[PDB]
Design a protein around this ligand. Structure first.
Ligand SMILES: [Zn+2]
Length: 257
């Protein structure tokens, strides 16, 4: 089965998933001097005030915070999107050291971690159908740098002990994802794919320019999770990031000059 190890890592995924070497794969390096400022791009519209979080799950490849997506409660609208996208889950990718961990890079610079808030397009009625369409998903990417602590992330960090191994889940109600956003909503946008198996090319990527700060202690807690199940040899959940993929015939547009 696929993973991030020496024998089942990113460079092996193409054997089981032939879309790994596709025309619009993610992540990519964001060349800030080559990105095209587009004045037709509208501001992002994030409406998370009615968000309803339910559970936190260790799925073996990261931890996911899941949300009730049965109604328009937490939606992403605006920017380069047409229609309403509902929040279904968020997760992180992080490193073994502070100098790596993000999937995206900015002028080849790696950040300590990257947060992905995953949304699906409501005209296709369920997440399962949205992943089979080219405009099916909208993912909000936010870079994490080590420096001051993020008060709004501690609730997530404190529960990691309860979901140490693959398959473990815990009740996680009343979590507000508005505590993880940066001050500015300026962003880069490009058409891409999921950064993990089945690597479907159904994502409009929205990467924020401003990163958020987390403490060494906070990111250290992420590094104590396990890829393995309970009663199995301990393999620390670290370096769960896919390296940059070629841009090919794609243009990165920026919302700011
Ligand atoms: Zn991700």
């Amino acid at each position: 089965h696929w993973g991030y190890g020496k024998h089942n890592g990113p460079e092996h995924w193409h054997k089981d998933f032939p879309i790994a070497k596709g025309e619009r794969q993610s992540p990519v390096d964001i060349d800030t001097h080559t990105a095209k400022y587009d004045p037709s791009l509208k501001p992002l519209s994030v409406s998370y005030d009615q968000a309803t979080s339910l559970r936190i799950l260790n799925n073996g490849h990261a931890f996911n915070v899941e949300f009730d997506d049965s109604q328009d409660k937490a939606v992403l609208k605006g920017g380069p999107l047409d229609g309403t996208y509902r929040l279904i889950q968020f997760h992180f990718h992080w490193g073994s050291l502070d100098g790596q961990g993000s999937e995206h890079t900015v002028d080849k610079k790696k950040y300590a971690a990257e947060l992905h808030l995953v949304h699906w397009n409501t005209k296709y009625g369920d997440f399962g159908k949205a992943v089979q369409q080219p405009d099916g998903l909208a993912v909000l990417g936010i870079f994490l740098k080590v420096g001051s602590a993020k008060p709004g992330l501690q609730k997530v960090v404190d529960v990691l002990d309860s979901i140490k191994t693959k398959g473990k889940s815990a009740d996680f109600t009343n979590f507000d994802p508005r505590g993880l956003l940066p001050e500015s909503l300026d962003y880069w946008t490009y058409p891409g794919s999921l950064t993990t198996p089945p690597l479907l090319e159904c994502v409009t990527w929205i990467v924020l320019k401003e990163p958020i700060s987390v403490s060494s202690e906070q990111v250290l807690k992420f590094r104590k999770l396990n890829f393995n199940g309970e009663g199995e040899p301990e393999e620390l959940m670290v370096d769960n990031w896919r390296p940059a993929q070629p841009l090919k015939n794609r243009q990165i547009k920026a919302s700011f000059k």
